[PDB]
Amino acid sequence: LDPGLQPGQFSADEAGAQLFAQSYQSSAEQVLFQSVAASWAHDTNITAENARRQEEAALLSQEFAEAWGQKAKELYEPIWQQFTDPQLRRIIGAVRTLGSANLPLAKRQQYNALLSQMSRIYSTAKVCLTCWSLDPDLTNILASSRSYAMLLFAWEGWHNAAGIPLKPLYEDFTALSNEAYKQDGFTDTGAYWRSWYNSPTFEDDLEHLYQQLEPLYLNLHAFVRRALHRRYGDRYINLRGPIPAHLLGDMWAQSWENIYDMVVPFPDKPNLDVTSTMLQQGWQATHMFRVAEEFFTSLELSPMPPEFWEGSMLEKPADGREVVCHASAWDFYNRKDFRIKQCTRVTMDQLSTVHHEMGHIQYYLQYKDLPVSLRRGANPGFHEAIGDVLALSVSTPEHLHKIGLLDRVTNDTESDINYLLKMALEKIAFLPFGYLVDQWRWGVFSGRTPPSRYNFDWWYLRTKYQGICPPVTRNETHFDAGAKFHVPNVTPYIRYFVSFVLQFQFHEALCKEAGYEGPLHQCDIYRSTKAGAKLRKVLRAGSSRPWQEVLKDMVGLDALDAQPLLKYFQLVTQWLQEQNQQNGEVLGWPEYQWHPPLPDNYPE
Amino acid sequence: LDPGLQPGQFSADEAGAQLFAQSYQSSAEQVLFQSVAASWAHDTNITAENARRQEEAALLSQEFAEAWGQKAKELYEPIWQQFTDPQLRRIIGAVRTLGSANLPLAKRQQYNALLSQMSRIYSTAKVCLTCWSLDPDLTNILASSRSYAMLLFAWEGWHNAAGIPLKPLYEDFTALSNEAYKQDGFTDTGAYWRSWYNSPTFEDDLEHLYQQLEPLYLNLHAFVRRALHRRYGDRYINLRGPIPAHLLGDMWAQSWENIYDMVVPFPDKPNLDVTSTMLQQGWQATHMFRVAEEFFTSLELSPMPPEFWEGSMLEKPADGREVVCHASAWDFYNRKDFRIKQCTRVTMDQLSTVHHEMGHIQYYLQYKDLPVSLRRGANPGFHEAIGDVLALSVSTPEHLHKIGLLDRVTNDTESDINYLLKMALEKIAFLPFGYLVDQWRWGVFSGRTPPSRYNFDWWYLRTKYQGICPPVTRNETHFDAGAKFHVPNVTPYIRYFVSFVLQFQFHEALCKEAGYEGPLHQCDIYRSTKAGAKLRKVLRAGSSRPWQEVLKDMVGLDALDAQPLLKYFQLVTQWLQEQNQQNGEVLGWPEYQWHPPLPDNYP
Numbered sequence A: 001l002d003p004g005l006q007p008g009q010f011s012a013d014e015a016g017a018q019l020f021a022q023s024y025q026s027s028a029e030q031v032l033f034q035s036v037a038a039s040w041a042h043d044t045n046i047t048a049e050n051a052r053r054q055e056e057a058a059l060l061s062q063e064f065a066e067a068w069g070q071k072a073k074e075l076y077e078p079i080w081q082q083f084t085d086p087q088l089r090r091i092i093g094a095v096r097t098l099g100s101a102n103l104p105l106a107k108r109q110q111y112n113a114l115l116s117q118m119s120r121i122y123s124t125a126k127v128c129l130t131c132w133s134l135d136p137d138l139t140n141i142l143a144s145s146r147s148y149a150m151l152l153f154a155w156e157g158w159h160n161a162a163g164i165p166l167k168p169l170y171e172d173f174t175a176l177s178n179e180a181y182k183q184d185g186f187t188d189t190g191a192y193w194r195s196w197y198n199s200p201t202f203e204d205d206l207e208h209l210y211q212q213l214e215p216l217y218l219n220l221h222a223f224v225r226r227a228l229h230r231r232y233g234d235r236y237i238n239l240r241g242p243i244p245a246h247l248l249g250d251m252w253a254q255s256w257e258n259i260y261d262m263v264v265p266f267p268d269k270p271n272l273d274v275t276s277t278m279l280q281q282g283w284q285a286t287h288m289f290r291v292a293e294e295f296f297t298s299l300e301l302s303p304m305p306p307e308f309w310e311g312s313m314l315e316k317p318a319d320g321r322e323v324v325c326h327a328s329a330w331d332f333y334n335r336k337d338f339r340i341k342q343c344t345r346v347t348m349d350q351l352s353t354v355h356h357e358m359g360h361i362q363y364y365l366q367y368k369d370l371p372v373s374l375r376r377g378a379n380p381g382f383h384e385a386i387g388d389v390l391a392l393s394v395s396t397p398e399h400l401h402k403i404g405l406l407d408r409v410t411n412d413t414e415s416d417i418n419y420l421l422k423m424a425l426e427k428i429a430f431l432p433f434g435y436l437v438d439q440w441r442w443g444v445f446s447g448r449t450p451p452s453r454y455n456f457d458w459w460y461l462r463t464k465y466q467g468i469c470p471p472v473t474r475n476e477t478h479f480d481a482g483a484k485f486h487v488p489n490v491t492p493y494i495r496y497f498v499s500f501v502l503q504f505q506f507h508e509a510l511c512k513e514a515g516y517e518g519p520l521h522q523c524d525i526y527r528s529t530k531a532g533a534k535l536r537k538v539l540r541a542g543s544s545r546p547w548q549e550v551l552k553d554m555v556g557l558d559a560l561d562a563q564p565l566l567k568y569f570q571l572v573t574q575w576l577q578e579q580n581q582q583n584g585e586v587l588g589w590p591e592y593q594w595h596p597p598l599p600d601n602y603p604e
Numbered sequence B: 001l002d003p004g005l006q007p008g009q010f011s012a013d014e015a016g017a018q019l020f021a022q023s024y025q026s027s028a029e030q031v032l033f034q035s036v037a038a039s040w041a042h043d044t045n046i047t048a049e050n051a052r053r054q055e056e057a058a059l060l061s062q063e064f065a066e067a068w069g070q071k072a073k074e075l076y077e078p079i080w081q082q083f084t085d086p087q088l089r090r091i092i093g094a095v096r097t098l099g100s101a102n103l104p105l106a107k108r109q110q111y112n113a114l115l116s117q118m119s120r121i122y123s124t125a126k127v128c129l130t131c132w133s134l135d136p137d138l139t140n141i142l143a144s145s146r147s148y149a150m151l152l153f154a155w156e157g158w159h160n161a162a163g164i165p166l167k168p169l170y171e172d173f174t175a176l177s178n179e180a181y182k183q184d185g186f187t188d189t190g191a192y193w194r195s196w197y198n199s200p201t202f203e204d205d206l207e208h209l210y211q212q213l214e215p216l217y218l219n220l221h222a223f224v225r226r227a228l229h230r231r232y233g234d235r236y237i238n239l240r241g242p243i244p245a246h247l248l249g250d251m252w253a254q255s256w257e258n259i260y261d262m263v264v265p266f267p268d269k270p271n272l273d274v275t276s277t278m279l280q281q282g283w284q285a286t287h288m289f290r291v292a293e294e295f296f297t298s299l300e301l302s303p304m305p306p307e308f309w310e311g312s313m314l315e316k317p318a319d320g321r322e323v324v325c326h327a328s329a330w331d332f333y334n335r336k337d338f339r340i341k342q343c344t345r346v347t348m349d350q351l352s353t354v355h356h357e358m359g360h361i362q363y364y365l366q367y368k369d370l371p372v373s374l375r376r377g378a379n380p381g382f383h384e385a386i387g388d389v390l391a392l393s394v395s396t397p398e399h400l401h402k403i404g405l406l407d408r409v410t411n412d413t414e415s416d417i418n419y420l421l422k423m424a425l426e427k428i429a430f431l432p433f434g435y436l437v438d439q440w441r442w443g444v445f446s447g448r449t450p451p452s453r454y455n456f457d458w459w460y461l462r463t464k465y466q467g468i469c470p471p472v473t474r475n476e477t478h479f480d481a482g483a484k485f486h487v488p489n490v491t492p493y494i495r496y497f498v499s500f501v502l503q504f505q506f507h508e509a510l511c512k513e514a515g516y517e518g519p520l521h522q523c524d525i526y527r528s529t530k531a532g533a534k535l536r537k538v539l540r541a542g543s544s545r546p547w548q549e550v551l552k553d554m555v556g557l558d559a560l561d562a563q564p565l566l567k568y569f570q571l572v573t574q575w576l577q578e579q580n581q582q583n584g585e586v587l588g589w590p591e592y593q594w595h596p597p598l599p600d601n602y603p
C-alpha cells in the first residue's frame, strides 16, 4: 500500500478517532475511486484485461481496508462504542469491519477472481438455436411473446445457460464470504447483511408485514391465473395449481406489468401502457433520462451534472463490446463523477427503471459532502425507494397527460380499477419474490441449504411464496437462483421488499406535504417544492442517523408499515376479492405438485 | 371438583411451598388415576359412552390444575425461583404451567372432544377393495408384499382413509392448543413441548447430531435403493431420485428391517430374522412378554406385578370390539396398576416392540413411590430408550442362540456385516423420520405451516430428510401427516430421535459396567447385576434431577453424543461406503422432483 495511503499514529481516544477518520477519508476517496473506476471499465467493456485490472484494484482496496481496519481495532477496539460523537461511532464501526480483507492474500485473490468469473458468466451468457442475449432479446421474448413454446425455450435456455456453470463457483464464494465475515464476529454473511437494518426483530418484522400483504397477492394471482387459463387452455394452466414460471411477462415472474394487456379489467377505457405512444413519438434513451431529470428539478432537487451526461452509458453499445446490461447507478466517491449504466429500451417499464436509477444518483448528489463512510441510504431500502416514489407520480394518468403520453383523460371507477391493477401487477406481484430471494440466500449462508439442495430449496420458496412452478423438470445440476443477476453479483435483495413497503409510506407523506387532498393513488407531487424539501432532508442525511429516526421525521412513524400500501390499493383489493368469489376461484395453489406438460413438438 | 381436592392455605416462603407440594401430590394421584382409568376404558373399547366418560375426566383434571396453578402463582409467583431446594423449584415450576386449563370452559370442552374424534378416526379407519385394518392387515402387507401394485393400494388406501377426514379437526385442535399454552408464556405449543429438555441450545444440538449421522443414512439409502432397483426395475426406481415411500417395509418408511431379506449383504449365511423359528416353535404374545420380563429380572430389576398380567391387553380382541391397536404402556398413578395394551403379533420386530413397551413399565415400577410430578423420565427420550437398550442385547446372534431362536453363528466378518446391516435397517433408517416429524409439527404450531401448506411442508421434509417421494400424486386435500398415529393422538415425536442416540450411549455405559470387552455390537448385558444396578439408579431418579446430571452419572458425559452410535455401527458404515463406490452410486437424491409412474391398470 502506497505510503500516502497508510495510517499514521493517533491517540487512543475520541479526539484521535476524529483525526483518524479525517485522515482515512482523504485516502479512502482515492482508493474507492480507483476501484469504482476499474469496475466501470470492466462492466462497460468486459475483457480479460479489464477483469485483471478490476481484480488488482479490488486487492488494493482490501489492503487499505486491512491496514485502516487493524489500526482502528488496535487503537479504539474497546472505546468506539462509548464515543459521544454518533457520526464518528458509525464511521469507526464501518472501518473496523474488514470483510473479505480478513482473508489471507491467497484467499483474497480466490475471492476476487470468483466475483469476476461469476459476473462474467452471468453477463455474457447467451441462448443459441445465432445467439440471443438476455437484454434485449430474451427480455423482449418474455415480455411480448404469447407463444407457450417460444417463451419456454427462452426460459429454459436462460436458466440453463446462466445457472448451470455458476454453481461450483457459487459454492466456493459462499464458503469464502462466510470465512471472511466470521472473523468480524458474525455467524455468517447473512447475519452481517441483516445487521444493516439495526433491528433485533428484523426477520419477525418482515414476516408480520408479509402476512398483511399476502391476501393481496393471493387475489391478484388467482385473477391472473384465470386470464392465463382463458388464453393458454386447461392443459397448460391449472386453476388450482401454481402458474408456469415463464408466462408472467418477465424472466423471473417478478413483475407482471407486461401481461397487462391480457388482464386489463376494462379494455375501452384509456390504454395505460404508453409504450406504443413513446415509440410513435420517437422517444429515445436520452429523452427518457431528461424527462426523469426534469421531475427532480421540478421538486428543486439537483439536475444531473455534466459529468453524468458525458460519462454515462445509456444505450447498449453498438460497436461490438460486451457489457453488463443490468441497470445500475454509480458513485465514484470523488464528489464529481456519478453515472448510470443502462441498456435502455424505449418502454414504459424502462421509464420507471430510469427513474429508479436516477433516484440512486440523486441520493449520491445530496450526500456527496458527508464522510465517505456515511455515503449510503439510512438503510439500503431507502436508497431503493427514492426513484420509485417519483415514478408513482409519473405513472398516474394525469401526469402522463401532462407529459404528452396519454391524450385521453377520464376519472371514473373503471379507469381507477384499470390503473390500480396495472400498478398491482408491478408492485404487489413483486412482494413474494422480494421477500423470498434472501430467505434462500440466508439459508445458504447459514448452512441450512447446502449445495445438494440449492435448487430444491429455491423452488420450495418460489412455489411457497409466488405460487409458480418451473415449466420443465429441474434437478440439482440446475442452479436456477444463479440465473438471477443479484446472486452471482452478490447484491442483497431484501432491500427491494423493504423498498416496496417504504415507498408507499413516503408517497403518502410527500402527498400530504404537497397539499394534495384526493385519493392517494391519484396524487402527483410534480412541481411541489414543499415535497421536494421534505425528500431533500432524507437524502442529505445519508447514513449519518438511525433510519428509524429519519423515517419518523419524514412520515411521523419510526417503523415499516403496510398501511399506506394497503390504502393506495384498497379499491382494487376489494374489487379483486369480489371478482374472484363471483368466479368461484380457489385462492392459493393446493395442487402444489402440479407441473405443466411439454408442448408436443418441443423444442424441435 | 371435590372440596377435598381443592387447595389449602400455605405461607409464602420455601417452608410453605414444601407443605404445598406435598398437599398437591396427595390430591393429584386420585385425579390422575380416574383420568387414566377412563382413557383405558376408551382405548380398549372405543364407543361414544367411553368417549363421553373420558371427556368428563379430562374436564375434572383441568379443574384441578386450574385451582392448584392459580394458588401456586398466587402464593409463590415471584419467589419460587430463589428456593434453595432444586427438586422443589422444578415441582413448583410444573404446577404453575396450566396448559389446557388456561382455556375457558367451552373451549376446554371443544379441545377434549377433538382429541376423541381424531383418536377414533385414526384407530377405526379401514381400506376396502371385506376391509383391511392397519394392524394387522396393512402392517403385514407393507412388511411382506413385494408387489408394487398391492403395496401402492395399501399405502394410498391408508393415507387417504386416515388423513383426509383428520385435516379439519387437526386445524381446530392446533388453534386451541396454542391459545392454551400462550397463557403460560410460550410463543406456541411447540415451544412448550421443547421446554421439556431444559436446554437453551436444543434445536442447534439436534441439528449438530443429525449432521454427524446423516452420512450413515445417505449410504444406507443408496445401498437399499440399489437393491430395490434390481427388484422393481428402472420404471419405478430412480437411482438418482427419492425412493417411492411404499417400498421399504413400513407404512411410513420409518424403519426398513422388513425388507432385510431383499438386501441382506451375504445371503446364504443363517437367517438373522428369527420370525420363522418363533412361529415354528409356537410362540404367542404371552411368551414374548415373559421372555422380556425375564431379561429385566436377570438384571435384578422388577418382575411385572400380578395387576399387570391380569389387566393388560396383549392380543387384539377377537370379539371384534374397536381398539386402539397402537402399542402403549400405562401408568395409573396409584402405585399398583401398570398395563400394556398391544395387538401383539408373533414376529421378531414385535419382540423388540414388546421390550420397548416393557421398558416403560419398568420405569413406572422403579419411580412409583415418588411425588407424581417426578414420575416421568429424566427427559421423555430417557423413557423411550430403556426397553430399546435391552432389545439391543436381545437382538445379538449370541443372545438369540441362548434363548433357542438361532443356531450358533460363525463369528466372522460376514455374519457381523449381516447383523449390523439388519440393525442399521432398524435404527439408522429411522433417524431422519425421528428428526423430521416434530420439525413439521413445530412449524404448524408456530404458524409457519398454515393448513394451506400442511402436505406441501410434510412432503418437503420427507424428501429433504428421508429421500422418499409419494408413489401417487398428493395435494392439499390430503393430510398425510395425519396418517401417522402420533399426529392425531397429539404425542410428541422428537423423544424418539433423542432415544435413538441415547440408547447407544446407555448401551456402551452398561456394557462397560458389565465388564464386557469385545466389540460394542456383540455385547449382551443379560444377567449383569452391575449393569442392572446402574440402570436402576437412572430409573429411580425419575425427573427429580436435571437429565444432564443423571446422564453424566450414568455414562460420563453430560450431553447427547452420537459417538457411541457411530462406534456400534463403524464396520457396516465402512462397508456400505465401499459397496456404494464400487456400484458407482450417487449419494442423495439430486433428481428431487422425480415421482414414479402408476402401474398399468391401477387400480
Ligand SMILES: *[C@@H]1O[C@H](CO[C@@H]2O[C@@H](C)[C@@H](O)[C@@H](O)[C@@H]2O)[C@@H](O[C@@H]2O[C@H](CO)[C@@H](O[C@@H]3O[C@H](CO)[C@@H](O)[C@H](O)[C@@H]3O)[C@H](O)[C@H]2NC(C)=O)[C@H](O)[C@H]1NC(C)=O
Pocket: A398, A411, A517, A518, A519, A522
Ligand atoms: C377524481 O374523482 C375523485 C372523486 O371526486 C368526488 O366524487 C365525485 C363522484 C364527484 O362528486 C366529485 O365532485 C367529488 O369531488 C376526486 O377526489 C376527491 O377530491 C376532493 C379534493 O380535490 C376531495 O375533497 C376535499 O376534502 C378535503 C378533506 O379531505 C377538504 O378539506 C377539501 O375542501 C376537499 O373538498 C374528496 O375527498 C376526494 N374524494 C375521494 C374519494 O377521495 C379526485 O380528486 C378526482 N381526481 C382527478 C385525478 O381529477
Ligand SMILES: *[C@@H]1O[C@H](CO[C@@H]2O[C@@H](C)[C@@H](O)[C@@H](O)[C@@H]2O)[C@@H](O[C@@H]2O[C@H](CO)[C@@H](O)[C@H](O)[C@H]2NC(C)=O)[C@H](O)[C@H]1NC(C)=O
Pocket: A472, A473, A474, A475, A476, A477, B240, B590, B591
Ligand atoms: C438432471 O437433468 C439433466 C438435464 O436433463 C434435462 O433435465 C432433466 C431434469 C430432464 O428434464 C431431462 O429430460 C432433460 O434432458 C440430465 O442430464 C442430461 O440428460 C439428458 C437426457 O437424460 C442427456 O441427453 C444430456 O446429455 C444431459 N445434459 C443435458 C444438456 O441435457 C441429468 O442426467 C439429470 N440428473 C442429474 C443427476 O443431473
Ligand SMILES: *[C@@H]1O[C@H](CO[C@@H]2O[C@@H](C)[C@@H](O)[C@@H](O)[C@@H]2O)[C@@H](O[C@@H]2O[C@H](CO)[C@@H](O)[C@H](O)[C@H]2NC(C)=O)[C@H](O)[C@H]1NC(C)=O
Pocket: B398, B411, B412, B413, B414, B416, B516, B517, B518, B519, B522
Ligand atoms: C468375535 O471375534 C472378535 C475378533 O475378531 C474380529 O472381530 C469380529 C467382530 C469379526 O468381525 C472378525 O472378522 C474379526 O476378525 C472377538 O473380539 C476380540 O475379543 C477380545 C475379548 O474381549 C478383545 O480383547 C478384543 O479387543 C476383540 N477384538 C476386536 C476385533 O474387537 C469377539 O470378542 C468374538 N466374539 C465371539 C462371539 O466369539
Ligand SMILES: C[C@H](N[C@@H](CCc1ccccc1)C(=O)O)C(=O)N1[C@H](C(=O)O)C[C@H]2CCCC[C@@H]21
Pocket: A254, A326, A327, A328, A329, A353, A356, A357, A384, A489, A491, A496
Ligand atoms: C434494475 C435494478 N438494478 C439494481 C442494480 C443493483 C446493483 C448493486 C451493486 C452492483 C451492481 C448493481 C438497482 O439499481 O437497484 C434491479 O435489479 N431491481 C430489482 C430487479 O430487477 O431484480 C428489483 C427492482 C425493483 C424496481 C426497481 C428495479 C429493481
Ligand SMILES: C[C@H](N[C@@H](CCc1ccccc1)C(=O)O)C(=O)N1[C@H](C(=O)O)C[C@H]2CCCC[C@@H]21
Pocket: B326, B327, B328, B329, B353, B356, B357, B360, B384, B489, B491, B496
Ligand atoms: C410402538 C411405539 N408406541 C408409543 C406409544 C406412545 C403413546 C403416548 C401417549 C399416548 C398413547 C401412546 C411408545 O411406546 O412410545 C411407537 O409409537 N414408536 C414410534 C413409532 O412407531 O412411530 C417410534 C418407535 C421407536 C422404537 C419403539 C417404538 C416407537
Ligand SMILES: *[C@@H]1O[C@H](CO)[C@@H](O[C@@H]2O[C@H](CO)[C@@H](O)[C@H](O)[C@H]2NC(C)=O)[C@H](O)[C@H]1NC(C)=O
Pocket: A045, A047, A048, A049, A050, A321
Ligand atoms: C475495451 O477495453 C480494452 C482493454 O481490454 C481497450 O483496449 C485498449 O484499446 C486501444 C485500442 O483498442 C489500445 O491503445 C490499448 O493498448 C488497448 N489494450 C488492449 C489490451 O488491447 C479497448 O479500447 C476498450 N474499448 C473501448 C471502446 O473502450
Ligand SMILES: *[C@@H]1O[C@H](CO[C@@H]2O[C@@H](C)[C@@H](O)[C@@H](O)[C@@H]2O)[C@@H](O)[C@H](O)[C@H]1NC(C)=O
Pocket: A240, A590, A591, B472, B473, B474, B475, B476, B477, B478
Ligand atoms: C387432489 O387429488 C385428488 C385425487 O387424485 C389425485 O389427483 C388427481 C388429479 C390424479 O392426478 C390422481 O392420480 C391423484 O392421486 C383429486 O380428486 C382432487 O381434485 C385434487 N385436487 C384437490 C383440490 O383436492
Ligand SMILES: [Ca+2]
Pocket: A143, A257, A258, A347, A348, A349
Ligand atoms: Ca413491459
Ligand SMILES: [Ca+2]
Pocket: A250, A255, A257, A258, A349
Ligand atoms: Ca418489466
Ligand SMILES: [Ca+2]
Pocket: B249, B250, B255, B257, B258, B349
Ligand atoms: Ca417393522
Ligand SMILES: [Cl-]
Pocket: A193, A196, A380, A381, A492, A493, A494, A495
Ligand atoms: Cl439489503
Ligand SMILES: [Cl-]
Pocket: B193, B196, B380, B381, B492, B493, B494, B495
Ligand atoms: Cl418429547
Ligand SMILES: [Zn+2]
Pocket: A356, A357, A360, A383, A384
Ligand atoms: Zn436500485
Ligand SMILES: [Zn+2]
Pocket: B356, B357, B360, B383, B384
Ligand atoms: Zn415408547
